[PDB]
Amino acid sequence: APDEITTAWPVNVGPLNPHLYTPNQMFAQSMVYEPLVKYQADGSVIPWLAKSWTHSEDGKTWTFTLRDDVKFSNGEPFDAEAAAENFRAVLDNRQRHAWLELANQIVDVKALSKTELQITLKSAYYPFLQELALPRPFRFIAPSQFKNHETMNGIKAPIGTGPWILQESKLNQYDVFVRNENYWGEKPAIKKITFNVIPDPTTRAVAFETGDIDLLYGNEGLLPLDTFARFSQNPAYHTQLSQPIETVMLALNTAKAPTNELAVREALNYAVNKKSLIDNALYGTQQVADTLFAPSVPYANLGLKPSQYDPQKAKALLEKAGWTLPAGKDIREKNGQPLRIELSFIGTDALSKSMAEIIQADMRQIGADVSLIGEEESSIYARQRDGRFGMIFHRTWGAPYDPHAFLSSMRVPSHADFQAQQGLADKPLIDKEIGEVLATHDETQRQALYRDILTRLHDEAVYLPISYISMMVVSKPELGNIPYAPIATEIPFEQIKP
Numbered sequence: 001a002p003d004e005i006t007t008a009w010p011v012n013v014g015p016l017n018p019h020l021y022t023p024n025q026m027f028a029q030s031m032v033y034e035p036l037v038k039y040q041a042d043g044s045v046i047p048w049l050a051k052s053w054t055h056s057e058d059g060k061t062w063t064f065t066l067r068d069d070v071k072f073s074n075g076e077p078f079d080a081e082a083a084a085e086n087f088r089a090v091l092d093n094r095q096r097h098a099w100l101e102l103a104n105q106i107v108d109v110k111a112l113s114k115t116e117l118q119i120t121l122k123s124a125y126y127p128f129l130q131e132l133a134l135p136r137p138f139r140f141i142a143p144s145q146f147k148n149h150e151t152m153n154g155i156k157a158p159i160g161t162g163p164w165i166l167q168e169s170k171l172n173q174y175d176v177f178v179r180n181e182n183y184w185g186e187k188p189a190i191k192k193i194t195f196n197v198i199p200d201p202t203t204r205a206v207a208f209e210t211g212d213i214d215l216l217y218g219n220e221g222l223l224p225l226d227t228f229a230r231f232s233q234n235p236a237y238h239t240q241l242s243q244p245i246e247t248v249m250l251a252l253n254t255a256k257a258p259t260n261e262l263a264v265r266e267a268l269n270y271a272v273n274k275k276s277l278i279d280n281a282l283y284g285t286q287q288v289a290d291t292l293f294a295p296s297v298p299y300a301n302l303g304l305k306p307s308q309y310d311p312q313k314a315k316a317l318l319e320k321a322g323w324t325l326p327a328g329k330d331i332r333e334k335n336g337q338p339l340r341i342e343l344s345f346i347g348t349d350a351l352s353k354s355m356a357e358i359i360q361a362d363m364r365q366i367g368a369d370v371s372l373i374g375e376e377e378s379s380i381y382a383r384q385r386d387g388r389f390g391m392i393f394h395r396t397w398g399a400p401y402d403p404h405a406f407l408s409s410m411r412v413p414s415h416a417d418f419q420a421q422q423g424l425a426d427k428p429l430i431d432k433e434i435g436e437v438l439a440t441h442d443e444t445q446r447q448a449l450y451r452d453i454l455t456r457l458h459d460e461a462v463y464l465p466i467s468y469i470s471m472m473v474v475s476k477p478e479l480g481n482i483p484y485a486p487i488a489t490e491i492p493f494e495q496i497k498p
């Protein structure tokens, strides 16, 4: 039927525990589970499951008035008690959510009545509403589906209030969702969505060409970029490329030789012709990035000075720092030790490998030897967590995470950004300022703190920004224009309208 669609994802959607992470897929958690307040493209939140809210003068006590007409898909009521139970279930696993500062801030959550929900915070945490709006963890499963009154040890059925219900899942095969016919809000036009499990980008493209799938929606890894460019000219197909959503960069390890040297990090930042990299590996589909956050990101229009491609300057920086070329070698040495940097990436990711090859070539031209370490996913994740890298590929998180949640997370030692920043003399100051920016009520101070944090990270050359990447779509023309969701990790299936 014209109201059933087939799409693809590299893996199954997972258990759809609203309160846990891998192997749960975020877009799918967002299809089934809903927030108190909903994030909009303009940075605001709107009423959602909560129709209104107020807060105390000290900004620490918040009271939400909930809708009274909402049922979970299994017919049980959504009310303040169910909401409170969800917050308990999440916070019973508090350490797992440490990355998200709201999880460290909530002191108590109480149902004052069926419609009145009160949340008390440790401090006047400014990004409160924005963090409630995220795909996870603060969304709501029917408390009847808790296991022993918890969710951290698993759930029973993935029962949400959302416009989609999971019908069935097959490990390594597919997942099927259907429209919730008892949804509180607007009925989606689409009645059924099947996700074929297709891990390889080439075979995803092939599945589209064969007519086996109707829609592909994702970031720069969705399908091969040469193929996407060809499809964009194919009159039988529809394609889209959004405005950019987030940054792709290298993170440089400030605590490990030779990237511990500011002059080395600055030189690497002048060595890469990013337009060439994009035109070579990414088929011209992305935009050049010269700062951690694009100037269009809130609080990040700071006039930071780009390091334009300038290999002469990169060489002069290295020379001044004592890295000089032996006869007749191309790789610089200092104290008889070679300028060698390891770049870790997922070895089976063709796009990462392509970018890595370009980066290696560019850095060789300024006398740096980049050794390519391609490993399995698990090993790469372990490297980022533990700081076992010279350089790694890394990305920001898109709206509404950027900048505040991404910065917040830089304070967490078991993540790539902290690990990359660990060697900076001003790392403690940066981390102090990040705490301060999240809690300040003074807008002038907030802007100044964001300026200082981002200026230090820029001036200290912690990152090598590469490009601002876009969402991509490939679809059968009959589906029409495909909208984007405000939150970068969500897919707006409910808005698709043939």
Ligand SMILES: O=C(O)CN(CCN(CC(=O)O)Cc1cccc(O)c1O)Cc1ccccc1O
Residues within 6 Å of the ligand: 021, 022, 099, 136, 137, 397, 489
């Ligand atoms: O992604 C991280 O770096 C850390 N995560 C927090 C920030 N996340 C938001 C989120 O996951 O809710 C941003 C995020 C954005 C896009 C895709 C993701 O998988 C993704 O996680 C926590 C995490 C733990 C375990 C597995 C995956 C995880 O992402």
Ligand SMILES: [Cl-]
Residues within 6 Å of the ligand: 021, 022
């Ligand atoms: Cl985990």
Ligand SMILES: [Cl-]
Residues within 6 Å of the ligand: 022, 023, 024
């Ligand atoms: Cl995952």
Ligand SMILES: [Cl-]
Residues within 6 Å of the ligand: 051, 052, 053, 054
């Ligand atoms: Cl309000």
Ligand SMILES: [Cl-]
Residues within 6 Å of the ligand: 329, 330, 331
């Ligand atoms: Cl050599």
